[PDB]
């Protein structure tokens, strides 16, 4: 899965 | 009264530094890759910033993906002339406190007359001498700059905070006559829709720059990788509408 949705979905 | 303005002061990312090895000698490859790993570092902070700024993470995380992937450079490169402004009073590009392009770097990194361009829209922020608010103001409306020709997936919602986010700036400017204050607004939306060409072009760049990575020694990280790859060619194809307020 993507990166930005990583960053999208994590805490912070 | 501005209802946004001590979100936008408490959410704004603090400033990103490259790592550049300015005892070497510059090269384009050199100058494009240090330039593209700060460019992923800043994307890290541009998407904890987006997440913070109210109303963003109601829309569906499809849409959050396309705006992101759609307005990063435009954010970015008018925050780097934020920095240009505040620090170097427009005259060179300061892309990081450990990166900025003089003239001769602007040369040497194969997109002189881009970096110019970058140059006299940072040179617009002393003309117009744009207060931090209004900047702040101005950065977060470019979330909300590019669209899908087809449309986003909750459309009308972002339609509605877009608007918030336009009646923010005019609360700013009035807060901070109106005959002045509704020139001041048309000032500031006319510099927003003159960036749109000027990103234009500079996605154009990135594609080659892309396509060209290996033979040029020009390496994107990952994140930049993945996120060129999902929208600019897309943007270049004429999927994309630009939303100007002019
Ligand atoms: C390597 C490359 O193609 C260049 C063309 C335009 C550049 C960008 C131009 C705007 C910019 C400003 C920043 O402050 C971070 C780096 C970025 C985001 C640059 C990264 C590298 C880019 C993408």
Redesign the interface.
């Given at each position: 899965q993507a990166l930005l949705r990583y960053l999208l979905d994590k805490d912070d | 009264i501005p209802i946004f303005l001590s979100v936008l002061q408490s959410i704004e990312p603090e400033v990103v530094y490259a790592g550049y090895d300015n005892t070497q000698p510059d090269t384009s490859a050199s100058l494009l890759t240090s330039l593209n790993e700060l460019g992923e570092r800043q994307l890290?902070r541009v998407?904890?910033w987006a997440?913070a700024l109210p109303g963003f993470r109601n829309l569906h995380?499809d849409d959050?993906?396309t705006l992101?992937?759609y307005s990063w450079m435009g954010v970015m490169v008018f925050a780097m002339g934020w920095r240009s402004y505040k620090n170097v009073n427009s005259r060179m590009l300061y892309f990081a406190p450990d990166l900025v392009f003089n003239e001769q770097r602007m040369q040497k990194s194969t997109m002189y007359n881009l970096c110019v361009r970058m140059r006299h829209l940072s040179q617009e922020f002393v003309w117009l001498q744009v207060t931090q608010e209004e900047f702040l103001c101005m950065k977060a409306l470019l979330l909300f700059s590019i669209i899908p020709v087809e449309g986003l997936k909750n459309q009308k919602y972002f339609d509605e905070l877009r608007m918030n986010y336009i009646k923010e700036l005019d609360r700013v400017i009035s807060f901070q006559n109106p005959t002045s204050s509704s020139q001041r607004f048309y000032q500031l939306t006319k510099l927003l829709d003159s960036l749109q060409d000027l990103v234009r072009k500079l996605h154009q760049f990135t594609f080659d720059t892309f396509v060209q990575s290996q033979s040029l020694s020009v390496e994107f990280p990952?994140?930049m990788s993945?996120?060129i790859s999902?929208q600019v060619p897309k943007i270049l194809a004429g999927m994309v509408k630009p939303l100007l307020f002019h």
């Amino acid at each position: 899965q993507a990166l930005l949705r990583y960053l999208l979905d994590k805490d912070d | 009264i501005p209802i946004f303005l001590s979100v936008l002061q408490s959410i704004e990312p603090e400033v990103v530094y490259a790592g550049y090895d300015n005892t070497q000698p510059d090269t384009s490859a050199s100058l494009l890759t240090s330039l593209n790993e700060l460019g992923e570092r800043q994307l890290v902070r541009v998407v904890k910033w987006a997440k913070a700024l109210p109303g963003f993470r109601n829309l569906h995380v499809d849409d959050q993906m396309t705006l992101i992937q759609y307005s990063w450079m435009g954010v970015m490169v008018f925050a780097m002339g934020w920095r240009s402004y505040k620090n170097v009073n427009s005259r060179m590009l300061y892309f990081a406190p450990d990166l900025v392009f003089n003239e001769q770097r602007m040369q040497k990194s194969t997109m002189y007359n881009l970096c110019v361009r970058m140059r006299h829209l940072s040179q617009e922020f002393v003309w117009l001498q744009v207060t931090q608010e209004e900047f702040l103001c101005m950065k977060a409306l470019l979330l909300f700059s590019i669209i899908p020709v087809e449309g986003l997936k909750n459309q009308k919602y972002f339609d509605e905070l877009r608007m918030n986010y336009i009646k923010e700036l005019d609360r700013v400017i009035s807060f901070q006559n109106p005959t002045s204050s509704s020139q001041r607004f048309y000032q500031l939306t006319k510099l927003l829709d003159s960036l749109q060409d000027l990103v234009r072009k500079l996605h154009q760049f990135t594609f080659d720059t892309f396509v060209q990575s290996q033979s040029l020694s020009v390496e994107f990280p990952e994140m930049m990788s993945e996120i060129i790859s999902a929208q600019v060619p897309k943007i270049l194809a004429g999927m994309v509408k630009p939303l100007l307020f002019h």
